[PDB]
Amino acid sequence: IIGGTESKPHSRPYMAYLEIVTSNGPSKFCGGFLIRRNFVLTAAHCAGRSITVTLGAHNITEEEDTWQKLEVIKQFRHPKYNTSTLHHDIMLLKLKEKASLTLAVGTLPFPSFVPPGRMCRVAGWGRTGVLKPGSDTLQEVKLRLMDPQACSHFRDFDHNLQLCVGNPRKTKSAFKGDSGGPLLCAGVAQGIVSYGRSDAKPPAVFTRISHYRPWINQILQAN
Numbered sequence: 001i002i003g004g005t006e007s008k009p010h011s012r013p014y015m016a017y018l019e020i021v022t023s024n025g026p027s028k029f030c031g032g033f034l035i036r037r038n039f040v041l042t043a044a045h046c047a048g049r050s051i052t053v054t055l056g057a058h059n060i061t062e063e064e065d066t067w068q069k070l071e072v073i074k075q076f077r078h079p080k081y082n083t084s085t086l087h088h089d090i091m092l093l094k095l096k097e098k099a100s101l102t103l104a105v106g107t108l109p110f111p112s113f114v115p116p117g118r119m120c121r122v123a124g125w126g127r128t129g130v131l132k133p134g135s136d137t138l139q140e141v142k143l144r145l146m147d148p149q150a151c152s153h154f155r156d157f158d159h160n161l162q163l164c165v166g167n168p169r170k171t172k173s174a175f176k177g178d179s180g181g182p183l184l185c186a187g188v189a190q191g192i193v194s195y196g197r198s199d200a201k202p203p204a205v206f207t208r209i210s211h212y213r214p215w216i217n218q219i220l221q222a223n
């Protein structure tokens, strides 16, 4: 998160910190959010050979009793996810066990467009600048939902599939390490962080989760 503030600790109890493990390089990192006690929603580009999930974190470098480090037993990457266009960048992680509900850990389901100009909030442990590591503490930022023309320069952006997020006038943005984190508008999840520019100039592109709610429900019901 660039240009944000430190979250009040444990104020976003659905937030998931993901470590993405692959066989030929070091760990990479994503966000996500708990939508059922045994399912986390995140981005498909965060898939790996294995993934761990930490719930209940604030400062991710300091172990505490609120942490729940949970095994993922299966990754459900959207079957139409396209690595070239980045369409359908959405994935469900099924947890081995159900998370414990605590003050620090709870679910955020979302129901069955929010107009541009509205302000929304996104949180994450991602990089705080192009040349900076991920934040040790959960950060959040208020961003403007944009008209889709603001994201035209992402040639594969599509208004019905994706949200365009972050006024280009500001540095405020989701960034690398924040992928998969929820965008909340008036407390309701509307998007997850997908991609943006290497140089971090907003807007960034978020998956429009409303489009995917039927698919999410079909995975949840079969598993």
Ligand SMILES: C[C@@]1(c2ccccc2)C(=O)C([C@@H](c2ccccc2)c2ccc3ccccc3c2)=C1O
Pocket (backbone or CB within 6 Å): 020, 028, 029, 030, 045, 046, 047, 086, 174, 175, 176, 177, 178, 179, 193, 194, 195, 196, 197, 198, 200, 204
């Ligand atoms: C850390 C990283 C990652 C983490 C775990 C596994 C793989 C990659 C991840 O996310 C990305 C890419 C990306 C996005 C989409 C597809 C590939 C790479 C990215 C670049 C610019 C952005 C700008 C604004 C916000 C998010 C951005 C995300 C990574 O590199």
Ligand SMILES: [Zn+2]
Pocket (backbone or CB within 6 Å): 009, 010, 058, 064, 066
């Ligand atoms: Zn704590």
